[PDB]
């Protein structure tokens, strides 16, 4: 059951999918699973919805595993799902969050990539869509969104790690999120989680110009990384994507923010390079724990600022 699940190890796609079902079955009045589409290879795409009721409540969205090799992100998502059901009705501050906000959690945002990192190539990053006249496979799901699509910060070469695709939303894994969010209409925070580098970022990645909500986002980022540090002393930096890392066009939070989702953030988790993507299983739960502190901070702020 989810009480006997090993949270400190990396799992396969099937185990994570079995986990989703276990958690819904153990918490039928709190947690449900939504299929938002099928991947290029036909695998279902699922979102957990955590809700104490109401009808299209204001919601936080959290996604992990958009880039499939980023294993700590999926492993942390599993932990978060469990943390939510452990804490609701036990922790008062968290209970107050979920008595008002819904939470949507997409643990494996790129299932075909994820299965590929298990079957064939531990370092696979992209989707697994085939591109004609190319033998190279896949599109960078973090360059396929409709925000500066195709501008500097992405590549038109199908073989590139940052290939943008033929057009915005050409990847079904991306378009499925787009349609979910637009159909929902009441997403107030959108958090995309990646690794590694220990960063918390707000938009834009595609241009240098500051977002109009920059001072609010920046101070929230400061509050979040300070919360994160309070646990093991892990040091995160924060800023716009373009300043903290590099120019990237067609990325997720640029899109979400342009739809009016003000609290659009992207995390880069542990570590800063020693292990990079190959983070030991012994760092899964501390990464998750400290990251949960940062998440609490953003959620509470979203709760309090309509
Ligand atoms: C071999 C390697 O490291 N490749 C990079 C991606 C290529 C550009 C070289 C990468 O995979 N970056 C991931 C994490 C990272 C690694 C080293 C330094 C900094 C970051 P990333 O999660 O894939 C970085 C991410 C940044 C981002 C976040 C949100 C909106 C726009 C861009 C991205 O490139 O999508
Ligand atoms: Zn990434």
Curated annotation (Swiss-Prot):
Catalytic reaction annotation: Release of a C-terminal amino acid, but little or no action with -Asp, -Glu, -Arg, -Lys or -Pro; leukotriene C4 + H2O = leukotriene F4 + glycine
Residue span, Peptidase M14 domain: 9-302
Protein localization: Secreted
Name the coenzymes or cofactors required.
Zn(2+)
Residues where Zn(2+) binds: 67, 70, 194
Its GO CC terms are: extracellular space
Keyword field: Carboxypeptidase, Disulfide bond, Hydrolase, Metal-binding, Metalloprotease, Protease, Secreted, Signal, Zinc, Zymogen
Q: Does the keyword Cell inner membrane apply?
A: no
Active-site residues? 268 (proton donor/acceptor)
What does the UniProt cofactor note say?
Binds 1 zinc ion per subunit.
The entry's substrate-binding residues are: 67-70, 125, 142-143, 195-196, 246
Predominant place of localization: secreted
Annotated Gene Ontology MF terms?
metallocarboxypeptidase activity; zinc ion binding
Any idea of its EC number? 3.4.17.1
Which residues fall in a coiled-coil region? none
Regulation acting on activity, per entry: Inhibited by interaction with the S.magnifica carboxypeptidase inhibitor SmCI.
Job of this protein: Carboxypeptidase that catalyzes the release of a C-terminal amino acid, but has little or no action with -Asp, -Glu, -Arg, -Lys or -Pro. Catalyzes the conversion of leukotriene C4 to leukotriene F4 via the hydrolysis of an amide bond.
- Summarize the subunit comment: Monomer. May form a complex with proelastase 2.
Q: What is this protein called?
A: Carboxypeptidase A1
What phylogenetic lineage does the species belong to?
Eukaryota, Metazoa, Chordata, Craniata, Vertebrata
Q: Say which residues of the entire protein are included here.
A: 113 to 418 of 419
């Amino acid at each position: 059951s989810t009480d006997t699940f090993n949270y400190a190890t990396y799992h396969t796609l099937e185990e994570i999918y079995d986990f989703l079902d276990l958690l819904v079955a153990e918490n039928p009045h709190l947690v449900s699973k939504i299929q938002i589409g099928n991947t290029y290879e036909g695998r279902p795409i699922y979102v957990l919805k955590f809700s104490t009721g109401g009808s299209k409540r204001p919601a936080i969205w959290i996604d992990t595993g958009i880039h499939s090799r980023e294993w700590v992100t999926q492993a942390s998502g599993v932990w978060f799902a469990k943390k939510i059901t452990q804490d609701y009705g036990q922790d008062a501050a968290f209970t107050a969050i979920l008595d008002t906000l819904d939470i949507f959690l997409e643990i494996v945002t790129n299932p075909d990539g994820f299965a590929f990192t298990h079957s064939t190539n531990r370092m696979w990053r992209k989707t697994r869509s085939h591109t004609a006249g190319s033998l190279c496979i896949g599109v960078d799901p973090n360059r396929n969104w409709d925000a500066g699509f195709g501008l500097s910060g992405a590549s038109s070469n199908p073989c590139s790690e940052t290939y943008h695709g033929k057009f915005a939303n050409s990847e079904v894994e991306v378009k499925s999120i787009v349609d979910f969010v637009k159909d929902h209409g009441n997403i107030k925070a959108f958090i995309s989680i990646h690794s590694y580098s220990q960063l918390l970022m707000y938009p834009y990645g595609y241009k240098t110009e500051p977002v109009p909500d920059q001072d609010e986002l920046d101070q929230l980022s400061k509050a979040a990384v300070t919360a994160l540090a309070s646990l093991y002393g892990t040091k995160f930096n924060y800023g716009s994507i373009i300043k903290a890392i590099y120019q990237a066009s067609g990325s997720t939070i640029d899109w979400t923010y342009s739809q009016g989702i003000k609290y659009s953030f992207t995390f880069e988790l542990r570590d800063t390079g020693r292990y990079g993507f190959l983070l030991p299983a012994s760092q899964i739960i501390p990464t998750a724990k400290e990251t949960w502190l940062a998440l609490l901070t953003i959620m509470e702020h979203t709760l309090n600022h309509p």
